[PDB]
Amino acid sequence: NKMEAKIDELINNDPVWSSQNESLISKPYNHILLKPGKNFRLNLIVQINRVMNLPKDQLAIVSQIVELLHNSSLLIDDIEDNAPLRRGQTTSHLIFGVPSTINTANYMYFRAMQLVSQLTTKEPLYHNLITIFNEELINLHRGQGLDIYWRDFLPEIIPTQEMYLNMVMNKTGGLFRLTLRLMEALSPSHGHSLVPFINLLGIIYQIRDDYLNLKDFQMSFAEDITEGKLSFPIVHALNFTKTKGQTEQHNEILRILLLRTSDKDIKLKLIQILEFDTNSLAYTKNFINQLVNMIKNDNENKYLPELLYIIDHLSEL
Amino acid sequence: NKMEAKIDELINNDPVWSSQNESLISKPYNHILLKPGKNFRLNLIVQINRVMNLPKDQLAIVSQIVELLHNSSLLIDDIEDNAPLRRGQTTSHLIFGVPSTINTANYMYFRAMQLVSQLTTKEPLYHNLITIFNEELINLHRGQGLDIYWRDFLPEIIPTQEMYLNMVMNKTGGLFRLTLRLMEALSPSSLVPFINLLGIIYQIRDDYLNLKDFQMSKGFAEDITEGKLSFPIVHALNFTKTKGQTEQHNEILRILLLRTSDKDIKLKLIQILEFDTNSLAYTKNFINQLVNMIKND
Ligand SMILES: CC(C)=CCC/C(C)=C/COP(=O)(O)OP(=O)(O)O
Numbered sequence: 068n069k070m071e072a073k074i075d076e077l078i079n080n081d082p083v084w085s086s087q088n089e090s091l092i093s094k095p096y097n098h099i100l101l102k103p104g105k106n107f108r109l110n111l112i113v114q115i116n117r118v119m120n121l122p123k124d125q126l127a128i129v130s131q132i133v134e135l136l137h138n139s140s141l142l143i144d145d146i147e148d149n150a151p152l153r154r155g156q157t158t159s160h161l162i163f164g165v166p167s168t169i170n171t172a173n174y175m176y177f178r179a180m181q182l183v184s185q186l187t188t189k190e191p192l193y194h195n196l197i198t199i200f201n202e203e204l205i206n207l208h209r210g211q212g213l214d215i216y217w218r219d220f221l222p223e224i225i226p227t228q229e230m231y232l233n234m235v236m237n238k239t240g241g242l243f244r245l246t247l248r249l250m251e252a253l254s255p256s257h258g259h260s261l262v263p264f265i266n267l268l269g270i271i272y273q274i275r276d277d278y279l280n281l282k283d284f285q286m287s288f289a290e291d292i293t294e295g296k297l298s299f300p301i302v303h304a305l306n307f308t309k310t311k312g313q314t315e316q317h318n319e320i321l322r323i324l325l326l327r328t329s330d331k332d333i334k335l336k337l338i339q340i341l342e343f344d345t346n347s348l349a350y351t352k353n354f355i356n357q358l359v360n361m362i363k364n365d366n367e368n369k370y371l372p373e374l375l376y377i378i379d380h381l382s383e384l
Numbered sequence: 385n386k387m388e389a390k391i392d393e394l395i396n397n398d399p400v401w402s403s404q405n406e407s408l409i410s411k412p413y414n415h416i417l418l419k420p421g422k423n424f425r426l427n428l429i430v431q432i433n434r435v436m437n438l439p440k441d442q443l444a445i446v447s448q449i450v451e452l453l454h455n456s457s458l459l460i461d462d463i464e465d466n467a468p469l470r471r472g473q474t475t476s477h478l479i480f481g482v483p484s485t486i487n488t489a490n491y492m493y494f495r496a497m498q499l500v501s502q503l504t505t506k507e508p509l510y511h512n513l514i515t516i517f518n519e520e521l522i523n524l525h526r527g528q529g530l531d532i533y534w535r536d537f538l539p540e541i542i543p544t545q546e547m548y549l550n551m552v553m554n555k556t557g558g559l560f561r562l563t564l565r566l567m568e569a570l571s572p573s574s575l576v577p578f579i580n581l582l583g584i585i586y587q588i589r590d591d592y593l594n595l596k597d598f599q600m601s602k603g604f605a606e607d608i609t610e611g612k613l614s615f616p617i618v619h620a621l622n623f624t625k626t627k628g629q630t631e632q633h634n635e636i637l638r639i640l641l642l643r644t645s646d647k648d649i650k651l652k653l654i655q656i657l658e659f660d661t662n663s664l665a666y667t668k669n670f671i672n673q674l675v676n677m678i679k680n681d
Pocket residue numbers: 139140141143144148207208211214238239276487
């Protein structure tokens with residue numbers, strides 16, 4: 068009778084959720100907020116609004132959405148890559164546990180989704196916005212999915228340079244495109260689609276990330292090696308040795324990646340294979356320079372609409 | 385040039401994705417499809433439809449949506465719960481790894497969202513359906529978030545019965561209400577409260593049999609191994625606190641925090657609930673009262 072009352076009261080109302088609960092579930096996410104870089108992301112949005120000109124109000128929601136997805140994908144990525152550190156501080160899963168961190172990351176994907184219906188009340192443009200959201204999140208997952216698959220099934224498949232570019236288009240292009248596409252759809256104005264340029268951007272960004280992880284270490288943790296990642300320099304190297312018939316160095320690269328080693332001496336050995344044998348770091352520094360020139364020597368603004376500036380500090384988005 | 389030309393063809397096209405790739409990343413999910421239960425969910429979708437009168441085309445798409453959401457939920461939940469088995473089979477994360485399983489499950493959440501647009505060509509309705517989809521998935525994660533937090537940080541928070549039921553309304557109620565609300569919005573013809581009570585009965589009976597089955601044989605009482613704040617455990621913990629059974633309250637916590645698979649230790653915990661806190665009898669009677677709230681409707 069009193070129990071039935073309380074039950075009937077419970078089931079006739081919306082599920083209870085307090086802000087103390089919100090705070091609990093938010094701890095793993097809030098922890099990654101301490102990580103810097105929010106400005107270089109924001110700067111890229113700002114700079115881009117000069118072409119799209121979204122009403123400051125609207126630009127902020129787009130910004131919050133982007134932040135949520137970006138930070139959430141990183142929380143997940145660190146669990147998937149078993150990373151002990153991010154932007155120098157301890158990763159969330161190591162503090163709040165893998166359980167809570169996955170759940171919080173996933174919760175924020177859907178919170179981000181909710182922020183979408185607040186960009187416009189126009190029913191047709193709403194659909195477009197959700198579709199854009201849906202599609203790019205699907206691409207991000209396909210790309211991350213292949214990145215993980217090749218790493219975890221090695222040495223079953225060894226990606227070619229081209230397979231890798233297709234992976235990055237999905238993986239790193241997803242959020243770049245998502246941000247750009249939302250803005251172009253909300254633009255009250257602006258010229259050619261700036262997507263090809265945001266694509267080139269994502270690509271440059273990922274190779275440089277793959278590059279600097281090995282270079283910073285050479286000149287002085289190179290986690291990518293410990294992770295066993297088919298990064299750009301590695302794909303080059305594996306394909307070079309197979310092509311040049313260098314069986315030993317090929318297998319030697321495979322063996323080090325498969326060790327999932329934290330050993331600095333072994334780490335160096337692979338980098339030395341990469342400098343002296345396949346010259347892959349040099350090859351990669353070059354490849355990036357050319358992608359960058361495709362935007363620098365863009366006189367007929369085929370890709371272009373300050374961008375030179377972002378492109379150089381791109382490593383901190 | 386050839387490189388610049390190749391970079392140019394790439395950036396001016398949609399990302400390349402093949403059925404081979406699709407295939408490779410669906411491995412974790414295809415594995416869980418083997419497991420049963422799929423027909424009762426359809427049976428439940430079907431029964432409710434005797435009321436909702438949805439055309440069979442649309443009913444099929446709601447089923448597909450719900451199955452994808454549920455199975456993905458299970459893939460993740462087993463990672464979160466460190467579960468070795470599901471429906472008597474090895475969990476995907478132990479076969480394909482935690483990384484691919486987390487990615488594929490999340491991938492499938494978005495494939496499900498993508499299917500919502502196959503339900504209508506009418507914008508006003510579309511918007512409602514997406515909102516429902518969005519709202520319940522937010523509820524589901526809030527629920528899951530408390531269940532995981534209370535457990536992984538025990539004894540930081542000792543939930544009360546009222547708190548457990550709020551968690552369950554979000555967590556279990558989330559998928560029940562998702563199906564029903566989408567069906568109710570597609571009806572050319574609410575049962576929300578009833579679906580909420582069905583969810584709660586569902587959850588408490590599930591918690592209860594996990595322990596009872598093992599006390600009797602039949603089951604592994606894996607909830608103890610997980611350290612879960614189940615309905616019988618929540619009753620025992622508040623009963624002990626309130627009745628001043630310090631040692632017992634503490635032994636319950638200690639056993640939960642062992643994450644043990646020792647049968648005698650789990651049996652000792654269960655017998656504490658049976659003879660000391662009488663949490664089992666209590667859960668049984670509570671389940672019965674709730675079942676009466678329907679059968680007596
Ligand atoms: C579906 C998900 C979670 C996608 C993640 C997308 C992303 C920004 C990954 C980062 O991994 P990375 O290979 O670029 O390495 P890092 O840790 O340096 O960013």
